[PDB]
Design an enzyme around this catalytic site. Sequence first.
Site, PDB file in Angstrom:
ATOM      1  N   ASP A   1       0.894  -1.057  -0.009  1.00  0.00           N
ATOM      2  CA  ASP A   1      -0.036  -0.121   0.114  1.00  0.00           C
ATOM      3  C   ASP A   1       0.927   1.168  -0.142  1.00  0.00           C
ATOM      4  OD1 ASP A   1      -1.895   2.029   0.254  1.00  0.00           O
ATOM      5  OD2 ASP A   1      -2.408   1.432   2.499  1.00  0.00           O
TER       6      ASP A   1
ATOM      7  N   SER B   1      -0.658  15.591 -12.075  1.00  0.00           N
ATOM      8  CA  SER B   1      -0.795  15.308 -13.420  1.00  0.00           C
ATOM      9  C   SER B   1      -1.099  16.303 -14.292  1.00  0.00           C
ATOM     10  CB  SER B   1      -2.066  14.380 -13.594  1.00  0.00           C
ATOM     11  OG  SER B   1      -2.485  14.196 -14.664  1.00  0.00           O
TER      12      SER B   1
END
Length: 330
Positions: A35, A199
């Site tokens: 994770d 992004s």
Amino acid sequence: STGSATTTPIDSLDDAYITPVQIGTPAQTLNLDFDTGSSDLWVFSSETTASEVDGQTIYTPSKSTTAKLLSGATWSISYGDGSSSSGDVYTDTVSVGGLTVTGQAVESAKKVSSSFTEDSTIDGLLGLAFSTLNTVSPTQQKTFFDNAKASLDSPVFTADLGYHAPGTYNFGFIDTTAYTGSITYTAVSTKQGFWEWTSTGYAVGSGTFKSTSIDGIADTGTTLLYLPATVVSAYWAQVSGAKSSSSVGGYVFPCSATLPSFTFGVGSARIVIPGDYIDFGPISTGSSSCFGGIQSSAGIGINIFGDVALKAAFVVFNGATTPTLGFASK
């Protein structure tokens, strides 16, 4: 040193991935959920409330000659999906794919919430976010990667998750045979303890690319892709019959649909998520309403590049003095 381990989807939907991990002496092998959105290595154990164990493999520290109680240390964690676990702490030897760390904090669960009990395939979590998020008190502990870093050939790990197929976590090297083209690196902020990056925009299907900054986290422990409501609305507007359902808890679409791809930007580069990766199947057994793999982050507080996005790429978690993320097509 290096390590290399295969990671395997837990079910036919790729809801999560499990990776075998050796703990203790002699080794006890548990299948852990790696994770990159948390920083605790915790396991089902001989200390876990018996009614809360249902099929998992447990760690028994009393059977490990290298286990030592970390005296006074406790842990307690709550995840974004509302699940939680807590317990005490041992140090022991932990190996992943041939890479060994001695003295790793192994957090032994005394209690787990129902979603953990109900998932017999996940024996615990192995956190790979930054150690500043580790919950052990009163002395915070380091992640497996942080402990291994100095010994690694290069201070990196890579995630190569498969679509409906096994993939690979590598530590200490970049397998240049595992991706196509070049790797595009992008800046990371560690201020929230996550692999947080920005992004450069998105496209829906064959549509034109929209240049816009989207701050989010690379999170292998989250199944879906969570993005701003504007972006998610633009995606689902291209699917006939798709709608946001408050009763189901997100966007659903007719199971008869063919989904468009979704592209996200990494600098000047582009990662394409095929439409099929966004299909999470019937909302309930036998339904013709299917659950979408792209959902709004509006109620979270952060955008999350989960498995839906990450499995479309070869992803480099670069733990150099200034960390960065790398993405390549594959």
